[PDB]
Amino acid sequence: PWKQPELDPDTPSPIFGGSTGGLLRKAQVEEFYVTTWESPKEQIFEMPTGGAAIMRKGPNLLKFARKEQCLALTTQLRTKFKMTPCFYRVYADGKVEYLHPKDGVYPEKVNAGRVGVNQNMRSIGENVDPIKVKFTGSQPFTI
Amino acid sequence: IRHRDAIISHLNWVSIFLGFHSFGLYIHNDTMSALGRPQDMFSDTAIQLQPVFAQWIQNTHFTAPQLTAPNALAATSLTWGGDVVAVGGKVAMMPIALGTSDFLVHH
Amino acid sequence: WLRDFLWAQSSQVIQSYGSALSAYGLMFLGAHFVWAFSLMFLFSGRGYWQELIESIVWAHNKLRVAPSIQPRALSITQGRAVGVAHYLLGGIATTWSFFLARIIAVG
Amino acid sequence: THIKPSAQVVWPIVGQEILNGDVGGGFQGIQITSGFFQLWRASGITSELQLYSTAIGGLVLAAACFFAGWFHYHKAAPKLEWFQNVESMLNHHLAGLLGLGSLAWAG
Amino acid sequence: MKDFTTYLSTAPVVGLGWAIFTSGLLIEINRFFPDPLVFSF
Amino acid sequence: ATKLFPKFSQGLAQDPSTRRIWYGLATAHDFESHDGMTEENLYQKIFASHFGQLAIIFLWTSGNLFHVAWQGNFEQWVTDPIHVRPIAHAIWDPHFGQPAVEAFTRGGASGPVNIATSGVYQWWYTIGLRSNQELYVSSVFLALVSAVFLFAGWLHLQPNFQPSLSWFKDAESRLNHHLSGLFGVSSLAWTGHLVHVAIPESRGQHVGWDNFLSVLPHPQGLTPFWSGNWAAYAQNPDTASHAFGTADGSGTAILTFLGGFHPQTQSLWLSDMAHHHLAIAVLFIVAGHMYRTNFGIGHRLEAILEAHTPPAGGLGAGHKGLFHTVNNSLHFQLGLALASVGTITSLVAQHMYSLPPYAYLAVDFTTQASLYTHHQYIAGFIMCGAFAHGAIFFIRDYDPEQNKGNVLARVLDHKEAIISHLSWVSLFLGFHTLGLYVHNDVVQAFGTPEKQILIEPVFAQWIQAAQGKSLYGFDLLLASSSSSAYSAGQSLWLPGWLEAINNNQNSLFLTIGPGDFLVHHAIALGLHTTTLILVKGALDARGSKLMPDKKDFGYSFPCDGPGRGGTCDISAYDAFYLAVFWMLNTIGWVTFYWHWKHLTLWQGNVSQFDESSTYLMGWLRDYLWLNSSQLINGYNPFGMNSLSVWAWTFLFGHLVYATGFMFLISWRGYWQELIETLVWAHEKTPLANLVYWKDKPVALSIVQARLVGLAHFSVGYIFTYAAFLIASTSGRFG
Amino acid sequence: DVAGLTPCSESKAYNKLERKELKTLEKRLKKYEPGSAPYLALQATKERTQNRFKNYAKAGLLCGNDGLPHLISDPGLALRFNHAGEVFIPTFGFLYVAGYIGHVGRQYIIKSKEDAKPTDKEIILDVPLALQLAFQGWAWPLAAIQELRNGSLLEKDENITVSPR
Ligand code: CLA
Ligand code: CLA
Ligand code: CLA
Ligand code: CLA
Ligand code: CLA
Ligand code: CLA
Ligand SMILES: CC1=C(C/C=C(\C)CCC[C@H](C)CCC[C@H](C)CCCC(C)C)C(=O)c2ccccc2C1=O
């Protein structure tokens, strides 16, 4: 966005008991994802890693082992309460990377700031045959 | 829902253990029969894995009218034990004996 | 179980021809058929049948007999349902025919 | 103990009249295994007139049930509060659907 | 009536009618001509 | 990540999962997809792999020779080629019991042995091997041959000795040399060995290396060859009352055309085989000077392909541009080679049983049955491989700009018509074959079997009458003396060929009834349907209406997801994997027909097959149920006979078939979630979370799922049918 | 006497099969009183079996070594040996009926594709139109070959959807 928010580990977690689909050994060895949002009131939601939790009125922080769980929680909060959350990725060494709102306006919008990458300027079906690209390491769709 | 993973994992473990200690028993019997070792089988003559609990329950229910249901004239069924009831020369109901094969198929 | 239960029995089912039990044997054979016919609904997928249907659509379009309702392959869930239904029907009918023929011929 | 139970008779069309086996009692038909003969013997049914009357009453009750479905959908449809009375449903089912039915069958 | 007629105009109803007609025709042919195998008169 | 096991794939190296092992094994010999490699390196790897495959072949046959010579009864079988069964190899199983050891002691052995069904005993008796020392020296010689083939594989892969890319592309010289040397002079050497050794050994004269160069193969002594008086070789053939082991009733003839079979052993004559291989040798050597080598004469393959374009646009551009298509694409040549070798294997299966080339092979019923079944299954598998590699050619290396308007572009143009017509003929055959079979089964069920539809195979019966079979009647060729075909060569091979074809005991043109015609039409249905699946996969390999860009996704990809209605099993690999099922069913049908017809012929109850193959209940009862009595009684609580191993491997095959079902019905997601739960269980327990996996356990891929299910299915199919076939043919016959 | 097959009238095993079927029918018949419905049903079955065995004879039918009749397949051989009605004429009749069905379906498809929403006409049949086309297909081969002649039977490949190469 205008200024990228920084992850605060001291923000309170939502009211929830024990978890079984939560963090495995990958969290302490590889990266794990952390979703934060700002609940205006006390309400009950459903986590993608198990049953139901209650989010606190204020900042809420949750931890997941997969980015798909973070985006599932993000779209559940956006469709149900229009929450606009955001999740970071934390590596084993503590590096924090901002993932979902890269320009802060969500990928449904445009913002006229992003650069289109991995785009082919030809129509699909105009790609060359696999015989044309052989023993070269380049796929017909990568050119 | 909050401990479904533990539920499914323990159910998977007990399913694997039951499948091993029943179907592997069957395969063991087939192999040691094909290997010429009738004394190494899990049969009624070689290694008796008799259903002691089922046999005890059968004996208790055969004696259910004797002490615990004194107003019943006979047993509630003839599968526990007793005489053989036949109609028209064909066996209507007779006592059923449970052995090693019965334990194997029940497990 | 193969020899003393499935091969020792089921001789009445295959020898039921020329008698009143023959339909059972007929059903028996048909049941085997249905049990086989499910398998490619259980195996395979949808893209192969969709492309075969596309070729058949080309054939009917050459003769101008292509239907207005576009023929499509069965859905993956639909294909799984058809496969499990035909598989269960074949197995249940096989056991029904074999059981009834064996238990009527010698029972 | 000597005549097999039979309640299905086929039409002689393409040689399927061989399915009308010699069940005994001067009758030809398919040996039924549903046990309806034993149920009718347990119910005191002796002649075919009682079976005819039971069939007519069953057809009348089926027509009444179809009329009830049409009526309770199109004409007089119960509200959501009527269905949600689980206590009344349980009481009426335990007392009249099961208890009164058991008493009527005992009588 | 025309709603009922269009209901009978649906594919399963006309399929049932065709199946009944064809089965009855073949069954009456096989009954009145018992066991036909060889086309002779 | 970046593990060392997939050294041919960087992307597979950085795979932190168990799949890296599996894809590290299945993509082991797909050099075209290996990273950082060229066509020359691929060709050199192909050469080294071919040398290795050859060395493995020679090691396997050397091991067969050694395990027959050691712990075998080859000399006892030579003395008595009827009574004593052959021995394959000894059994040393510490898990065996005393009744198992006593029951497996057969053929006059000192321990448990396996009765050989391969047919090496009959073959080696026919070619002249008699002693165990000859088999020993043959085994060590073939081991040395495998050693020098290993030397060739290592040496031709070494630097400064690797052949150039164009060296493999020398199609004309390779064709000329492999026609002249690999086929021609090899057959000349084989018929020379036949004339020198096998015919004297079949005439009671021992010709070894010690007495070589001192025993004349023919009493005339090579002067008829120079003078052109080649009829002196066909002067004194072996009589009808001739013993194969001795010199009684012998003759002096090395080359002849004595048609039919040897009356004593019911096999083809050795002089006939020698003359056949000599004629094949001279014809192949003559044909091997066709193509243009470095000399000034020959034929150019590209020029022949350019010239054979029909006028008036019948085939469009014709066969133009096809030379570069065949030469550049290894998969085109692979498909052509596998198709031709499968056709040849099917020919071998269809001709060995009717024309037994080895002495005392027709009497060995189990051997002939196993050989036919093995050859037909191998043929079907490699025809499926031929079509699969043709689809691989269509996906990987096919340039429409190169061969534009030619036959390949034309069959790609009207591929819908070909697929639709194949689907039509398959539907027609299956519909009416099942209709007739069900009609006959219902008719036989009603107690009046005369209502069943029995179409006499008049076409094949008329063909067999045109070739000598007078039992069907008629007045065609080779059955009436007034026919020009009968008059031509009436003293050459007809006095033997008609004698062999008019006898009903042998398998040469057996009597065929309506059930034979019905099962042949079912075989035609199987062939047409398998062809339809394979050409639907191959023609729609690079594109379809559902998937236009199927060339960009490679040959073996799982699906495109649930979009566009569902796209599972859309690759040509999945079409091949379905056609493997259909090919297995087809070869099962042909082997069921062969086994039942030959079993009824050997038992003498040919009428049982004639009146029982009409309806499928006869197939289920009189063949599948009647002949399985001795198989399932191999081991029981009563005791054990010699067929206990066949019963065990029969149940083994049924179990592997069941495990194929396990891998085939369920696809991925249940197993992925189950493995996830197992991962949580292992991670969240004491005393076992200390040991951890280096590679993350994952569910097997959908392509891998199809491969594993197909492998278990085929293994169970093969083991079950081999068990039933061998047990039924050996429990009542010897 | 073609294909080594004896005629059913002069055959031997055909008579054995006939006597066996009559014998088991009489064995089933003897278990019932003559004035009973199962007796009448078994007598009708025996009469039908005798009539079928008589009608299979005196019709050129051939059977080989089992008494079960065989059908001569090749036309010409069937034409010159009085076996045309075994398979040569039944396939002609089947081709007539199959072409009737195909021509009626083709006419219905073509006439139903003209109006708006043809899928509704496909899934809700126009019964008067279907019955009119049902009774107008008695001359299907003449009409089919005439549409072949004028080219309306076939569609040009430029107007037919074609899968990508
Ligand atoms: C024995 C089991 C069996 C049977 C009968 C079939 C039958 C068929 N398969 Mg399948 N197949 C099977 C197993 C089976 N498959 C398995 C296990 C696999 C491996 C996965 C495959 C793989 C496979 C492929 C890859 C392909 C086929 C194709 C076909 C068709 C072949 C055309 C033919 O022979 O005429 C049809 C013959 C039949 C016997 C079909 C059954 C119809 C009978 C007569 C009943 C008809 C209805 C009847 C009147 C009853 C009506 C009432 C009832 C519906 C309730 C046909 C629909 C091909 C196809 O689509 O053809 C164009 C094709 O591409 N199959
Ligand atoms: C008869 C066929 C068959 C067999 C044997 C199996 C076997 C298996 N499936 Mg499967 N299944 C099948 C068909 C079959 N499947 C089909 C067709 C479907 C489709 C509907 C499924 C659907 C299905 C589901 C949905 C599930 C299974 C599961 C299982 C497991 C059963 C649990 C157990 O105790 O296994 C024990 C193993 C066996 C019984 C295999 C035989 C073992 C023998 C005795 C060998 C013993 C060890 C041996 C000596 C070692 C060999 C040494 C060698 C390497 C040298 C096992 C891996 C379950 C699972 O994953 O585990 C719970 C599960 O959830 N299957
Ligand atoms: C004691 C009174 C009584 C009785 C006997 C029944 C009986 C029945 N109810 Mg009902 N029910 C009752 C009161 C009663 N209900 C009340 C008070 C409520 C509201 C709280 C409901 C709400 C209810 C629902 C929501 C449903 C039922 C259903 C059923 C049927 C269950 C299927 C069965 O067992 O087959 C037994 C079948 C027979 C014995 C065949 C004869 C059935 C006869 C015709 C019914 C006679 C009983 C009837 C209640 C008499 C009053 C009707 C009168 C106005 C004509 C059964 C007919 C189910 C249903 O719709 O089934 C159709 C269902 O889904 N019940
Ligand atoms: C002349 C013979 C020949 C040659 C040279 C090739 C060469 C090739 N084929 Mg072809 N193929 C052949 C025959 C041949 N194939 C036959 C006969 C079939 C039919 C079965 C196929 C079917 C086929 C398919 C479908 C595919 C190939 C592919 C390939 C490539 C990968 C091979 C590799 O390095 O991976 C090495 C591969 C393996 C190690 C896998 C082997 C696993 C086998 C099935 C296990 C053995 C079964 C069983 C478990 C054994 C134990 C039995 C048990 C009782 C103990 C390579 C270009 C692939 C390709 O080009 O990629 C796009 C591909 O997709 N081929
Ligand atoms: C005349 C010289 C000559 C000879 C003898 C060979 C011989 C051979 N070369 Mg060739 N080659 C030559 C010149 C020659 N080459 C030249 C000049 C070039 C360069 C232009 C090449 C380029 C070349 C390549 C690129 C390759 C070979 C390969 C091979 C081998 C083929 C496989 C094999 O063993 O056949 C086995 C097959 C037969 C002997 C006959 C085929 C089988 C048919 C169906 C007849 C069956 C006969 C009979 C019915 C069955 C008998 C057995 C049964 C009774 C058990 C073989 C060793 C391949 C290789 O490395 O080894 C695999 C290979 O990839 N060659
Ligand atoms: C009457 C409409 C009609 C017509 C003219 C055709 C014509 C054709 N089809 Mg098609 N087909 C149809 C309906 C039709 N089909 C239907 C409804 C189905 C779905 C079951 C198919 C499925 C189908 C397949 C899978 C294949 C063909 C093929 C063929 C060709 C071979 C000829 C043949 O008999 O195939 C045999 C056709 C069948 C076995 C389908 C019969 C389906 C029912 C029984 C007939 C429907 C009649 C219809 C209800 C009449 C409507 C009349 C109206 C007044 C209500 C030919 C171009 C084959 C091909 O491509 O050859 C080049 C091929 O592989 N068709
Ligand atoms: C065969 C097959 C198909 C192709 C089959 C299709 C599209 C369904 C065909 C249904 C037919 C039309 C039913 C009616 C058949 C007869 C025309 C009706 C009986 C006719 C007689 C009474 C005359 C799939 O689409 C598929 C999809 C997903 C998994 C597996 C499969 C699969 O195995």
JSON list of N, CA, C and O in Angstrom, two decimals, chain A residues 99-124:
[
{"chain": "A", "resi": 99, "resn": "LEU", "atom": "N", "xyz": [2.89, -10.69, 1.48]},
{"chain": "A", "resi": 99, "resn": "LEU", "atom": "CA", "xyz": [2.43, -11.57, 0.42]},
{"chain": "A", "resi": 99, "resn": "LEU", "atom": "C", "xyz": [1.17, -11.08, -0.29]},
{"chain": "A", "resi": 99, "resn": "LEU", "atom": "O", "xyz": [1.20, -10.88, -1.51]},
{"chain": "A", "resi": 100, "resn": "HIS", "atom": "N", "xyz": [0.05, -10.90, 0.42]},
{"chain": "A", "resi": 100, "resn": "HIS", "atom": "CA", "xyz": [-1.21, -10.79, -0.30]},
{"chain": "A", "resi": 100, "resn": "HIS", "atom": "C", "xyz": [-1.43, -9.40, -0.91]},
{"chain": "A", "resi": 100, "resn": "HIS", "atom": "O", "xyz": [-1.54, -9.30, -2.14]},
{"chain": "A", "resi": 101, "resn": "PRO", "atom": "N", "xyz": [-1.51, -8.30, -0.12]},
{"chain": "A", "resi": 101, "resn": "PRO", "atom": "CA", "xyz": [-1.77, -7.01, -0.80]},
{"chain": "A", "resi": 101, "resn": "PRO", "atom": "C", "xyz": [-0.47, -6.31, -1.20]},
{"chain": "A", "resi": 101, "resn": "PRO", "atom": "O", "xyz": [-0.01, -5.37, -0.54]},
{"chain": "A", "resi": 102, "resn": "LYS", "atom": "N", "xyz": [0.12, -6.78, -2.30]},
{"chain": "A", "resi": 102, "resn": "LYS", "atom": "CA", "xyz": [1.45, -6.31, -2.70]},
{"chain": "A", "resi": 102, "resn": "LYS", "atom": "C", "xyz": [1.45, -4.82, -3.00]},
{"chain": "A", "resi": 102, "resn": "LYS", "atom": "O", "xyz": [2.40, -4.11, -2.65]},
{"chain": "A", "resi": 103, "resn": "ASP", "atom": "N", "xyz": [0.41, -4.31, -3.65]},
{"chain": "A", "resi": 103, "resn": "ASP", "atom": "CA", "xyz": [0.21, -2.88, -3.79]},
{"chain": "A", "resi": 103, "resn": "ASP", "atom": "C", "xyz": [-0.84, -2.35, -2.82]},
{"chain": "A", "resi": 103, "resn": "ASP", "atom": "O", "xyz": [-1.18, -1.16, -2.89]},
{"chain": "A", "resi": 104, "resn": "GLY", "atom": "N", "xyz": [-1.36, -3.19, -1.93]},
{"chain": "A", "resi": 104, "resn": "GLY", "atom": "CA", "xyz": [-2.29, -2.75, -0.91]},
{"chain": "A", "resi": 104, "resn": "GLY", "atom": "C", "xyz": [-3.72, -2.53, -1.37]},
{"chain": "A", "resi": 104, "resn": "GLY", "atom": "O", "xyz": [-4.54, -2.07, -0.58]},
{"chain": "A", "resi": 105, "resn": "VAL", "atom": "N", "xyz": [-4.03, -2.85, -2.63]},
{"chain": "A", "resi": 105, "resn": "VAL", "atom": "CA", "xyz": [-5.36, -2.64, -3.18]},
{"chain": "A", "resi": 105, "resn": "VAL", "atom": "C", "xyz": [-6.03, -3.93, -3.61]},
{"chain": "A", "resi": 105, "resn": "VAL", "atom": "O", "xyz": [-7.09, -3.89, -4.25]},
{"chain": "A", "resi": 106, "resn": "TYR", "atom": "N", "xyz": [-5.43, -5.10, -3.29]},
{"chain": "A", "resi": 106, "resn": "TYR", "atom": "CA", "xyz": [-5.87, -6.46, -3.57]},
{"chain": "A", "resi": 106, "resn": "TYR", "atom": "C", "xyz": [-5.75, -6.78, -5.06]},
{"chain": "A", "resi": 106, "resn": "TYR", "atom": "O", "xyz": [-5.94, -5.89, -5.91]},
{"chain": "A", "resi": 107, "resn": "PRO", "atom": "N", "xyz": [-5.44, -8.03, -5.43]},
{"chain": "A", "resi": 107, "resn": "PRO", "atom": "CA", "xyz": [-5.16, -8.34, -6.84]},
{"chain": "A", "resi": 107, "resn": "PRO", "atom": "C", "xyz": [-6.37, -8.27, -7.76]},
{"chain": "A", "resi": 107, "resn": "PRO", "atom": "O", "xyz": [-6.19, -8.39, -8.98]},
{"chain": "A", "resi": 108, "resn": "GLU", "atom": "N", "xyz": [-7.58, -8.09, -7.23]},
{"chain": "A", "resi": 108, "resn": "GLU", "atom": "CA", "xyz": [-8.74, -7.89, -8.09]},
{"chain": "A", "resi": 108, "resn": "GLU", "atom": "C", "xyz": [-8.67, -6.54, -8.80]},
{"chain": "A", "resi": 108, "resn": "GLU", "atom": "O", "xyz": [-9.16, -6.42, -9.93]},
{"chain": "A", "resi": 109, "resn": "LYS", "atom": "N", "xyz": [-8.08, -5.53, -8.17]},
{"chain": "A", "resi": 109, "resn": "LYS", "atom": "CA", "xyz": [-7.93, -4.22, -8.77]},
{"chain": "A", "resi": 109, "resn": "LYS", "atom": "C", "xyz": [-6.67, -4.19, -9.63]},
{"chain": "A", "resi": 109, "resn": "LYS", "atom": "O", "xyz": [-6.02, -5.22, -9.86]},
{"chain": "A", "resi": 110, "resn": "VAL", "atom": "N", "xyz": [-6.30, -3.00, -10.12]},
{"chain": "A", "resi": 110, "resn": "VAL", "atom": "CA", "xyz": [-5.16, -2.83, -11.02]},
{"chain": "A", "resi": 110, "resn": "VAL", "atom": "C", "xyz": [-4.09, -1.93, -10.41]},
{"chain": "A", "resi": 110, "resn": "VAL", "atom": "O", "xyz": [-2.90, -2.26, -10.43]},
{"chain": "A", "resi": 111, "resn": "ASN", "atom": "N", "xyz": [-4.50, -0.76, -9.90]},
{"chain": "A", "resi": 111, "resn": "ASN", "atom": "CA", "xyz": [-3.69, 0.27, -9.25]},
{"chain": "A", "resi": 111, "resn": "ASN", "atom": "C", "xyz": [-2.72, 0.98, -10.19]},
{"chain": "A", "resi": 111, "resn": "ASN", "atom": "O", "xyz": [-2.06, 1.93, -9.76]},
{"chain": "A", "resi": 112, "resn": "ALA", "atom": "N", "xyz": [-2.62, 0.56, -11.46]},
{"chain": "A", "resi": 112, "resn": "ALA", "atom": "CA", "xyz": [-1.76, 1.17, -12.48]},
{"chain": "A", "resi": 112, "resn": "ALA", "atom": "C", "xyz": [-0.29, 1.25, -12.05]},
{"chain": "A", "resi": 112, "resn": "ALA", "atom": "O", "xyz": [0.44, 2.14, -12.47]},
{"chain": "A", "resi": 113, "resn": "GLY", "atom": "N", "xyz": [0.14, 0.31, -11.21]},
{"chain": "A", "resi": 113, "resn": "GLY", "atom": "CA", "xyz": [1.51, 0.32, -10.73]},
{"chain": "A", "resi": 113, "resn": "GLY", "atom": "C", "xyz": [2.25, -0.98, -10.99]},
{"chain": "A", "resi": 113, "resn": "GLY", "atom": "O", "xyz": [3.48, -0.99, -11.07]},
{"chain": "A", "resi": 114, "resn": "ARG", "atom": "N", "xyz": [1.52, -2.08, -11.11]},
{"chain": "A", "resi": 114, "resn": "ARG", "atom": "CA", "xyz": [2.14, -3.38, -11.31]},
{"chain": "A", "resi": 114, "resn": "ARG", "atom": "C", "xyz": [2.62, -3.52, -12.75]},
{"chain": "A", "resi": 114, "resn": "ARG", "atom": "O", "xyz": [2.12, -2.89, -13.68]},
{"chain": "A", "resi": 115, "resn": "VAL", "atom": "N", "xyz": [3.63, -4.38, -12.93]},
{"chain": "A", "resi": 115, "resn": "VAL", "atom": "CA", "xyz": [4.19, -4.69, -14.23]},
{"chain": "A", "resi": 115, "resn": "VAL", "atom": "C", "xyz": [3.79, -6.11, -14.59]},
{"chain": "A", "resi": 115, "resn": "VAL", "atom": "O", "xyz": [4.02, -7.05, -13.81]},
{"chain": "A", "resi": 116, "resn": "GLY", "atom": "N", "xyz": [3.19, -6.28, -15.76]},
{"chain": "A", "resi": 116, "resn": "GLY", "atom": "CA", "xyz": [2.73, -7.59, -16.19]},
{"chain": "A", "resi": 116, "resn": "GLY", "atom": "C", "xyz": [3.89, -8.48, -16.57]},
{"chain": "A", "resi": 116, "resn": "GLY", "atom": "O", "xyz": [4.62, -8.18, -17.53]},
{"chain": "A", "resi": 117, "resn": "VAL", "atom": "N", "xyz": [4.07, -9.58, -15.84]},
{"chain": "A", "resi": 117, "resn": "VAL", "atom": "CA", "xyz": [5.13, -10.54, -16.13]},
{"chain": "A", "resi": 117, "resn": "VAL", "atom": "C", "xyz": [4.50, -11.88, -16.48]},
{"chain": "A", "resi": 117, "resn": "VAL", "atom": "O", "xyz": [3.32, -12.13, -16.21]},
{"chain": "A", "resi": 118, "resn": "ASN", "atom": "N", "xyz": [5.32, -12.74, -17.10]},
{"chain": "A", "resi": 118, "resn": "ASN", "atom": "CA", "xyz": [4.92, -14.08, -17.54]},
{"chain": "A", "resi": 118, "resn": "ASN", "atom": "C", "xyz": [3.71, -14.03, -18.48]},
{"chain": "A", "resi": 118, "resn": "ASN", "atom": "O", "xyz": [2.81, -14.87, -18.42]},
{"chain": "A", "resi": 119, "resn": "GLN", "atom": "N", "xyz": [3.69, -13.03, -19.36]},
{"chain": "A", "resi": 119, "resn": "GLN", "atom": "CA", "xyz": [2.61, -12.84, -20.32]},
{"chain": "A", "resi": 119, "resn": "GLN", "atom": "C", "xyz": [3.14, -13.06, -21.73]},
{"chain": "A", "resi": 119, "resn": "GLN", "atom": "O", "xyz": [4.19, -12.51, -22.09]},
{"chain": "A", "resi": 120, "resn": "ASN", "atom": "N", "xyz": [2.42, -13.86, -22.51]},
{"chain": "A", "resi": 120, "resn": "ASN", "atom": "CA", "xyz": [2.77, -14.11, -23.90]},
{"chain": "A", "resi": 120, "resn": "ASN", "atom": "C", "xyz": [1.96, -13.19, -24.79]},
{"chain": "A", "resi": 120, "resn": "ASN", "atom": "O", "xyz": [0.73, -13.15, -24.69]},
{"chain": "A", "resi": 121, "resn": "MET", "atom": "N", "xyz": [2.64, -12.47, -25.68]},
{"chain": "A", "resi": 121, "resn": "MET", "atom": "CA", "xyz": [1.99, -11.52, -26.57]},
{"chain": "A", "resi": 121, "resn": "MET", "atom": "C", "xyz": [1.45, -12.17, -27.84]},
{"chain": "A", "resi": 121, "resn": "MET", "atom": "O", "xyz": [1.12, -11.46, -28.79]},
{"chain": "A", "resi": 122, "resn": "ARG", "atom": "N", "xyz": [1.36, -13.50, -27.87]},
{"chain": "A", "resi": 122, "resn": "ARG", "atom": "CA", "xyz": [0.74, -14.23, -28.96]},
{"chain": "A", "resi": 122, "resn": "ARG", "atom": "C", "xyz": [-0.49, -14.96, -28.44]},
{"chain": "A", "resi": 122, "resn": "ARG", "atom": "O", "xyz": [-0.65, -15.17, -27.24]},
{"chain": "A", "resi": 123, "resn": "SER", "atom": "N", "xyz": [-1.37, -15.32, -29.36]},
{"chain": "A", "resi": 123, "resn": "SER", "atom": "CA", "xyz": [-2.56, -16.09, -28.99]},
{"chain": "A", "resi": 123, "resn": "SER", "atom": "C", "xyz": [-2.17, -17.52, -28.65]},
{"chain": "A", "resi": 123, "resn": "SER", "atom": "O", "xyz": [-1.16, -18.05, -29.12]},
{"chain": "A", "resi": 124, "resn": "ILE", "atom": "N", "xyz": [-2.99, -18.15, -27.80]},
{"chain": "A", "resi": 124, "resn": "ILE", "atom": "CA", "xyz": [-2.78, -19.55, -27.47]},
{"chain": "A", "resi": 124, "resn": "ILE", "atom": "C", "xyz": [-3.12, -20.40, -28.69]},
{"chain": "A", "resi": 124, "resn": "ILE", "atom": "O", "xyz": [-4.09, -20.13, -29.41]}
]
